[PDB]
Amino acid sequence: RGCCNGRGGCSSRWCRDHARCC
């Protein structure tokens, strides 16, 4: 889970949907 830091962009679908910080 890199929705704060750890995905290839906070705008990736993973973090677009499962967003904690970004």
Side-chain angles (χ1 to χ4, degrees):
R1 63 198 310 187
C3 304
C4 305
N5 186 272
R7 281 302 72 184
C10 301
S11 193
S12 193
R13 179 178 61 190
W14 210 102
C15 291
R16 177 60 60 201
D17 201 75
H18 314 315
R20 305 188 72 180
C21 309
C22 58

